[PDB]
Amino acid sequence: LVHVASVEKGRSYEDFQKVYNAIALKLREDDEYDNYIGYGPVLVRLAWHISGTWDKHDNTGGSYGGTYRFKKEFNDPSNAGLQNGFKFLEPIHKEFPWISSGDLFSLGGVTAVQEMQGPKIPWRCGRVDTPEDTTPDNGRLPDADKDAGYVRTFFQRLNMNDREVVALMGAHALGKTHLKNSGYEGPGGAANNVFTNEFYLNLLNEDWKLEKNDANNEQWDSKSGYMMLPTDYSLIQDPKYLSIVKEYANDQDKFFKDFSKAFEKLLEDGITFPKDAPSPFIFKTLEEQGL
Ligand code: HEM
Fold first, then answer.
1. Which atom of ligand 1 approaches the CA of 143 most closely?
2. Closest residue (by CA) to atom 30 of ligand 1?
3. Do 40 and 125 fall into the same domain?
4. If exposure means fewest CB atoms within 10 Å of the residue's CB, which of 22, 104, 185, 210 is most exposed?
5. Domain count, the chain
6. Does residue 184's CB lie within 6 angstroms of at least one atom of ligand 1?
7. 81 lines ligand 1 (CB under 6 A)
8. CA-CA distance, 173 to 117, in Å (whole number)?
């Protein structure tokens, strides 16, 4: 399977910075969602789930085709709750009908991270919508009740190594688990709509307790009211993972730089960019624009 990136006709940087600003402005405006967390967390979750279907062996899935717009992917049990992110982006797509679905879903993830004061993420245009029959089947996204061996093995399919996996999991500092979407409940920390290295700090400094929640699933709970998934707590149980957790808990700039590289790689897996394609765009935030 080859997927070649094709720039939307005649569009350049200024066009995509308008779509960025439109998403960032609505992120500011619709601030009440999910008890004032806002839409930032569910939009980086949506960008990860539309990319997270990729398989390195036959180049199926991934962000290229925008196939989440089809019933089979939209109704995957693993995507429960993401309908809220889709409905948020739907007005913006009406306003910019020329952007492809894969491009809008991955740009939503980039815009949320930067607007929640995370690192700049270079982004490239050119994903092309593909037919309903290219939609990946359900079951390619990871389970949360497993151990380190499972996480390592699962991420080899998206060829992410240990460092890339631990950097990517730092996004669980954002938002929260919702019992009715996944069978888990609670936030992982106090700052859950600002991008920081708090996931690593909380994993190493909180007193975690294995308890059973109302959906009868086990999760790790702390006195402070925070929670960790079995697959989150895995990162301090494995010796390779644990030393990278300690490195990011002690250096927030190295975490930001490594997250940026692994999140761009995640969003670009499976896509072939021609050498006459434009360079990655670095978008300015509203704050840097005085908007
Ligand atoms: C083994 C890996 C992973 C598993 C099993 C996993 C699982 C989960 C689960 C069960 C939730 C709660 C969903 C809900 O109830 O609403 C969640 C939320 C979230 N995840 Fe993951 N995840 C993984 C990796 C990642 C990665 C790599 C990213 C992003 C780069 C990510 C970003 C998020 C975000 C931002 C939320 C919060 C969503 C919200 O507040 O609505 N996840 N994760």
1. 5
2. 168
3. yes
4. 210
5. 2
6. yes
7. yes
8. 13
Here the CATH number for the domain that contains residue 239 is: 1.10.420.10
Domain that holds residue 101: 1-141+263-291
Spatial CA neighbour of 66 closest among 143, 117, 129, 10: 129
Resolution value (Å, 1 decimal):
2.1
What's the CATH code of the domain at 282?
1.10.520.10
Question: Residue 133: how many CB atoms within 10 A of its CB?
Answer: 8
Residue 52 CA, closest ligand 1 atom number = 27
For CA atoms 269, 274, 275, 281, give the dihedral sign: negative
Experimentally, the structure was elucidated by X-ray
10 C-alpha vs ligand 1 centroid, how far in Å? 36
Residue 177 CB–ligand 1 contact under 6 Å: yes
Q: Which two tokens stand for residue 154?
A: 């699962």
Tokens matching residue 11: 């569009």
Any idea which residue has 């948020």 for tokens? 88
CA 8, 12, 15, 17 torsion-angle sign: positive
Any bridge partners for residue 3, and if so which?
A: 271
Q: Following DSSP, what letter does each residue of 52-76 receive, concatenated?
A: TT-BTTTTBSSSTT-GGGSHHHHT-
Q: Are residues 205 and 278 in the same domain?
A: no
